[PDB]
Amino acid sequence: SHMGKFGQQSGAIYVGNFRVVNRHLATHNDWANLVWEDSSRDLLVSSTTAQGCDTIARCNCQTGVYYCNSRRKHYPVSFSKPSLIYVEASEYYPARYQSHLMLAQGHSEPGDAGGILRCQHGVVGIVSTGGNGLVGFADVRDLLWLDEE
């Protein structure tokens, strides 16, 4: 019994002809094939040729399970709704307010960004931030165009 689906953990969400990755980890190839990006959400979407098997959740769940790479293990989480959160400077961004970010208590060290959070409806978001015993997930549920055709 689990608080969310187990699915692929490729470091990116694959749905329809889209690949959703942490903007700060997007590869040179992602940028050559850019569909959409938002620095304030730490999200980038690039285009693909082949159908991805993830389902994007369209719910208001505040519980789910994510994969933590540093522990090589899944954890159930309770997270706050998507909010505007102050994220201090890193090698990837200056200090700024990051929007659509969902906070939970959880392990999240550098390297853990890209871990996928799923509820029982599908993919909810992707690990983006960490620190002070918290893990922050970039929500993708509001992206209605992000789907299959």
Site string for Zn ion, 55-94 (x = CB under 5 A): --x-x-x---------------------------------
CB of 46 to Zn ion, least distance (A): 25
Give the CA angle between residues 94, 23, 79 to the nearest 5°. 85
Which residue in the set 13, 119, 135, 143 belongs to the binding site for Zn ion (CB under 5 A)? 119
Binding residues for Zn ion, rule CB under 5 A, total 5
Residues 43-62 that bind Zn ion (CB under 5 A): 57, 59, 61
CB of 118 to Zn ion, least distance (A): 8
Can you tell me the distance from the alpha carbon of 24 to that of 92, in angstroms, rounded to the nearest whole number?
6
Residue 24 engages Zn ion in binding (rule: CB under 5 A): no
| Residues that bind Zn ion in the complex, under the rule CB under 5 A | 57, 59, 61, 119, 121
